Motif scaffolding. Structure first.
Motif, short mmCIF file in Angstrom:
data_model
loop_
_atom_site.label_atom_id
_atom_site.label_comp_id
_atom_site.label_asym_id
_atom_site.label_seq_id
_atom_site.Cartn_x
_atom_site.Cartn_y
_atom_site.Cartn_z
N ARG A 1 32.90 38.86 34.58
CA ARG A 1 33.92 37.86 34.86
C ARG A 1 35.17 38.13 34.04
NH1 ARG A 1 32.29 32.99 37.14
NH2 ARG A 1 34.55 32.59 37.19
N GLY B 1 49.84 35.84 43.71
CA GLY B 1 51.12 35.26 43.39
C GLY B 1 52.21 35.58 44.40
N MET C 1 34.67 44.27 37.89
CA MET C 1 34.41 43.23 38.89
C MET C 1 33.07 42.54 38.64
SD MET C 1 32.80 42.69 42.20
CE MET C 1 32.81 44.21 43.16
N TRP D 1 42.17 34.74 42.05
CA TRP D 1 43.09 34.80 43.17
C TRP D 1 44.47 34.25 42.83
CZ3 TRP D 1 45.19 30.26 44.97
CH2 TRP D 1 44.56 29.08 44.55
N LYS D 2 44.68 33.87 41.57
CA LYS D 2 46.02 33.52 41.11
C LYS D 2 46.84 34.76 40.82
CE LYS D 2 44.26 31.35 37.50
NZ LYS D 2 42.88 31.91 37.49
N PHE D 3 46.20 35.92 40.68
CA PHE D 3 46.93 37.14 40.37
C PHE D 3 47.71 37.69 41.56
CE2 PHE D 3 43.41 38.07 37.05
CZ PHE D 3 43.94 37.08 36.24
N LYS E 1 37.79 38.55 44.86
CA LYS E 1 36.85 37.64 45.49
C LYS E 1 35.71 37.21 44.57
CE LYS E 1 34.14 37.24 49.76
NZ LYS E 1 34.71 35.92 50.12
N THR E 2 35.68 37.70 43.33
CA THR E 2 34.60 37.35 42.41
C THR E 2 34.75 35.92 41.89
OG1 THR E 2 34.57 39.67 41.73
CG2 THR E 2 33.33 38.10 40.38
N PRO F 1 42.21 35.92 31.81
CA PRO F 1 43.59 36.42 31.74
C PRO F 1 44.14 36.38 30.32
CG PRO F 1 43.59 34.19 32.58
CD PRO F 1 42.14 34.58 32.41
N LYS F 2 44.79 37.48 29.93
CA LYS F 2 45.45 37.56 28.63
C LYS F 2 46.84 38.17 28.67
CE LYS F 2 44.76 39.17 23.87
NZ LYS F 2 46.02 39.95 23.75
N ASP F 3 47.20 38.96 29.69
CA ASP F 3 48.45 39.69 29.71
C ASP F 3 49.34 39.17 30.83
OD1 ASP F 3 50.38 41.49 29.01
OD2 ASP F 3 49.22 43.29 29.49
N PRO F 4 50.59 38.78 30.56
CA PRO F 4 51.44 38.22 31.63
C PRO F 4 51.81 39.22 32.71
CG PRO F 4 52.25 37.58 29.47
CD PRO F 4 51.24 38.65 29.24
N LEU G 1 36.99 42.39 43.78
CA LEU G 1 37.68 42.10 42.53
C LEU G 1 38.27 40.70 42.54
CD1 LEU G 1 39.87 44.50 40.48
CD2 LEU G 1 40.72 42.20 40.99
N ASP H 1 37.79 32.91 39.82
CA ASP H 1 39.11 32.30 39.92
C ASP H 1 40.18 33.31 39.52
OD1 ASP H 1 38.41 30.30 36.93
OD2 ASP H 1 38.63 32.46 37.22
#
Ligand SMILES: [Mg+2]
Ligand SMILES: [Mg+2]
Lengths: 86, 132, 94, 98, 195, 133, 101, 113
Positions: free
Chosen positions: C7, C52, C4, C48-50, C43-44, C10-13, C41, C46
């Motif tokens: 930064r 979903g 956390m 918050w797309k995880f 809230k750090t 993303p790399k893994d779908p 985690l 961008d």
């Protein structure tokens, strides 16, 4: 005077226009090929978007059955009445 | 005696709204313009296009949300982005409301190749200004 | 905590199960500092797309508010009154 | 002699990200996707699910209409040409093996 | 059958982040707005229309967004990005000394999908020859060539370029025109010597 | 309580070239409502003063254009109906304003337009002399 | 689905004039120019005379879009006076006030 | 490359989430580019294929197949003047004008009077 005439010649050579003298019937060509014609200007070519597209879209969408066209309902209802009455 | 965007005075059992109640010579004095664009101002162009297109917008939306609206619309065009505002009744279900909202927004965006958004305010019964 | 602090990229779908099963482990372990860190985690940055899917978001919020309730509770209830937004299921109310 | 501030280069999204980080998320407010009036305001998880998935279904429907009748949306009214706004054409051409 | 929940008026507190609840431009949304502000011609023994169905507040332009607090916040946010003007430049004469050649373009912005409009192509520029020529023969020559592009009261020579549709093309043509004009004024001819 | 920890700042790069020097940013707002124009100009001048640049406010006159229409349809030459389009101007000048400051300010204002307004920018920038001269 | 057959003919004339716009301009220059041979001027004259009908930009008319009314149409708005008054009364358009000065 | 694109679109679909801000939907609109490019130069795109002011105005290189005194020279010089004066048309349309006049008087070369 010749001095002013050659001054105008130089100014024309510098700013693009013709140095050699020209009559009004010859400057007609210049200004005509400068200003575009009304036939080609979009003010005339596009007087309005096509009722073709508009009405065809709305007709197909009525056939889909989403746009309750009050005018068309009125029309077809009176046509049904007329064909019933002969 | 002029007949222009005005309702006849009845015995007093005709609910009428603000905009259709007030006269067309009271527009700038006690009303606002439904649309707001700069084609009417000097220096702009395509004012005829603006008028025809917004009239088509109003027609298509009025007829694709039939029976739910009870008043005129509000158009707000800031540069590229277009915004519409409507006042509707709680006639049909939120399912249908959202479905038609998305459908109309998508179709209008695809047609005018322009970013469009629309908002709707629900009312139990249409507000009446006076009984004429 | 170090994850956390740094930064994320993303790399893994398969990062959607991360959120949900992480909060499941949070509900199993039941620690307030753990909840704080797992909130920080997402809230750090961008990240918050995880969240979903609504199902994973529902499980997350449910277990989060559950642990916060089962931790005074004035801070917890005002947190909730500020951050309800959708209406949660009965479990959380229980 | 003369001092000049040096030029900088930004992205179309950098300024928007700055303006967004400038302001925090709204408190006690349903998602921006959902409407603001109370009647349409989804007040439960399952009904909200149904509502936004109906929105997505309407998006798919619009895709269907546009790809079934491109000639209506064929006119390029907007100045910047955008293929995302252009109709999509999944139409095989005449027989040509290559 | 379905019911609408009560508005956000009682829900919103006196202490509240208005720039956050209204980040961008949006409609009035009286259900979310707690203010009872009404607008409308009141009836005799009546009052203006309530904010509930007041579509005229929507008709009029909208400025609930971008409160003074929001403006302050965004200004302090973008203060990190804006740069500083050179302190050496604090007067018109000093600016014109540092950079004599003034040039300016212009263009409108209007509501609509399209954005081009031919007035974008025009660009004017200005320069006074009181310090640039450094001579008299070419001075007299060029002031005889130019008919009305000069101004002897304020001592400025001004020239406009729109012959090309692109602003950069007009700029390049204007600079090349000034260059060729200076190069052709440098020299002279026999009919110019004989006057 | 929910206050973010790490603010995501957009990337910025000071390129090798020097920023352009705008001598004067003169913006002209055309509108239909004095009150809307006053609100918009107050917004603009407040933003400019908080950003730390000079300002000045002028008010050109109101321009009106009218044209006569026949009040009725078929035969009425005595009775006409008239209209008037009123455009109201507002000027705002900014002197000694850097290129990047102009960029940020114009982005801000161009996103902060209202609808029923037109905005005309006139940018004046000084530059040195060419090399061929 | 245009308003009527006269609007149909007008739009046909407009399209023909557009698609023969540049050529008509060029040959009209070649005609109205004077220093060139008058024999060439006459050649271009019979060329224009043999050009097809509904090709000139003079046969078209600035008709209305809604009611197809030729007279009383503004070039700016392209709308008939009646439809303009209608929309101005209904407040559909923007920025138009009654000249009660 | 292909499977790289498949994996990239899979990652994008996994990243996709609902936005909750007008600024976020504006970021999306700018991402697909429908939102205008501020500052409005009115020339973001439509560069005329990198054309040049001299290619527009100076037609002397295009004018080579006739002497510098004749009436065809007079007419084509006035044509080039008008074309340079006109900004609306590009070098393509200007050379189209010029070559059409070339064809005209070269198929009417029977006179040369
Ligand atoms: Mg009368
Ligand atoms: Mg005529």
């Amino acid at each position: 005077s010749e001095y002013a005439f050659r001054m105008s010649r130089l100014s024309a050579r510098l700013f693009g226009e013709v140095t050699r003298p020209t009559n009004s019937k010859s400057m007609k060509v210049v200004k005509l090929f400068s200003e575009l014609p009304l036939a080609k200007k979009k003010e005339t070519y596009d007087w309005y978007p096509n009722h073709h597209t508009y009405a065809e879209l709305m007709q197909t969408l009525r056939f889909l059955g989403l746009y309750r066209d009050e005018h068309q309902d009125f029309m077809d209802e009176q046509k049904r009445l007329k064909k019933l009455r002969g | 005696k002029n007949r222009a965007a005005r309702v006849r005075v009845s015995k007093g059992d005709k609910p009428v709204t603000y905009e259709e109640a007030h006269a067309p010579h009271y527009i700038a004095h006690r009303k606002g313009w439904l649309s707001l664009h700069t084609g009417n101002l000097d220096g702009e162009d395509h004012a005829a296009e603006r008028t025809v297109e917004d009239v088509f917008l109003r027609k298509f939306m009025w007829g694709t949300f039939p029976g739910c609206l009870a008043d005129q619309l509000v158009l707000k065009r800031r540069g590229n982005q277009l915004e519409i505002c409507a006042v509707v009744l709680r006639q049909l279900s939120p399912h249908k409301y959202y479905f038609l909202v998305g459908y109309s927004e998508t179709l209008l965006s695809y047609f005018y190749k322009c970013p469009v958004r629309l908002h709707l305010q629900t009312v139990p019964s249409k507000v009446v200004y006076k009984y004429l | 905590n170090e994850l956390m602090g740094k930064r994320f990229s993303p790399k893994d779908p398969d990062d959607d199960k991360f959120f949900q099963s992480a909060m499941s482990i949070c509900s199993s372990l039941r620690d307030l500092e753990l909840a704080y860190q797992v909130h920080g985690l997402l809230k750090t940055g961008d990240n918050w797309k995880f969240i979903g899917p609504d199902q994973h978001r529902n499980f997350y919020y449910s277990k989060f508010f559950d642990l916060i309730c089962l931790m005074q509770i004035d801070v917890t209830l005002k947190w909730y009154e500020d951050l309800i937004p959708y209406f949660p299921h009965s479990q959380t109310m229980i | 002699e003369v001092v000049i501030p040096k030029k900088k280069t930004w992205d179309k999204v950098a300024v928007l990200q700055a303006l967004a980080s400038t302001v925090n998320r709204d408190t006690t407010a349903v998602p921006y996707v959902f409407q603001d009036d109370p009647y349409l305001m989804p007040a439960s998880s399952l009904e909200s699910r149904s509502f936004l998935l109906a929105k997505k279904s309407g998006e798919n429907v619009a895709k269907f209409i546009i790809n079934s009748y491109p000639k209506y949306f064929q006119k390029d009214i907007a100045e910047p040409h955008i293929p995302c706004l252009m109709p999509e054409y999944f139409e095989p051409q005449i027989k040509d093996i290559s | 059958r379905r019911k609408a929940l009560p508005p956000r008026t009682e829900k919103m507190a006196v202490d509240q982040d208005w720039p956050s609840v209204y980040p961008v431009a949006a409609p009035f949304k009286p259900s979310a707005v707690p203010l009872p502000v009404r607008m409308g011609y009141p009836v005799k023994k009546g009052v203006p229309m309530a904010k509930e169905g007041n579509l005229e507040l929507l008709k009029i332009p909208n400025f609930l967004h971008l409160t003074p607090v929001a403006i302050k916040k965004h200004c302090e946010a973008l203060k990190d990005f804006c740069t500083e003007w050179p302190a050496a430049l604090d007067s018109d004469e000093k600016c014109e000394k540092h950079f004599p050649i003034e040039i300016d373009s212009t263009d409108y912005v209007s509501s609509g999908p399209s954005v081009r409009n031919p007035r974008a192509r025009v660009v004017v520029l200005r320069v006074k020859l009181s310090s640039l020529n450094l001579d008299d023969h070419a001075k007299k020559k060029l002031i005889k060539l130019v008919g009305e592009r000069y101004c002897k009261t304020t001592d400025v020579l001004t020239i406009k370029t729109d012959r090309c549709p692109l602003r950069r093309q007009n700029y390049d043509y204007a600079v090349y025109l000034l260059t060729v004009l200076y190069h052709e004024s440098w020299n002279t001819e026999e009919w110019e010597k004989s006057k | 309580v929910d206050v973010p920890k790490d603010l995501t700042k957009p990337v910025v790069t000071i390129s090798d070239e020097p920023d352009i020097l705008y001598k004067r940013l003169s913006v002209l707002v055309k509108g239909h409502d004095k009150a809307v124009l006053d609100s918009y100009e107050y917004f603009a001048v407040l933003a400019a003063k908080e950003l730390g640049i000079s300002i000045k406010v002028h008010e050109p006159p109101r321009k009106i254009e009218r044209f006569t229409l026949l009040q009725s349809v078929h035969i009425y030459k005595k009775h006409r109906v008239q209209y008037e389009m009123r455009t109201l101007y507002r000027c705002l000048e900014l002197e000694h304003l850097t290129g990047s400051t102009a960029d940020v300010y114009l982005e801000y204002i161009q996103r902060n337009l209202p609808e029923g307004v037109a905005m005309e920018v006139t940018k004046t920038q000084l530059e040195q002399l060419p090399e061929h001269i | 689905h245009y308003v009527d057959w006269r609007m149909w003919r007008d739009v046909k004339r407009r399209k023909m004039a557009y698609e023969y716009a540049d050529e008509r301009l060029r040959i009209n220059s070649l005609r109205k120019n004077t220093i060139l041979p008058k024999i060439l001027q006459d050649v271009a004259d019979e060329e224009i005379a043999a050009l097809p009908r509904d090709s000139c930009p003079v046969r078209i008319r600035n008709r209305c879009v809604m009611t197809s009314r030729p007279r009383g149409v503004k070039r700016r708005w392209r709308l008939s006076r009646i439809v303009f008054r209608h929309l101005a009364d209904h407040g559909q358009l923007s920025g138009i006030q009654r000249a009660t000065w | 490359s292909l499977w790289d694109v498949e994996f990239a679109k899979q990652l994008a679909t996994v990243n996709e989430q609902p936005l909750q801000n007008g600024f976020e939907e504006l970021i999306q609109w700018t991402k697909e580019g429908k939102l205008w490019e501020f500052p409005i130069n009115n020339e973001a795109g439509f560069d005329d294929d990198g054309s040049e002011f001299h290619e527009h105005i100076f037609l002397e290189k295009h004018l080579e197949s006739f002497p510098k005194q004749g009436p065809i020279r007079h007419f084509m010089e006035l044509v080039t003047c008008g074309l340079s004066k006109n900004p609306y048309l590009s070098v393509k349309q200007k050379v189209e004008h010029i070559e059409w006049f070339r064809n005209y008087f070269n198929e009417k070369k029977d006179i040369l009077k």
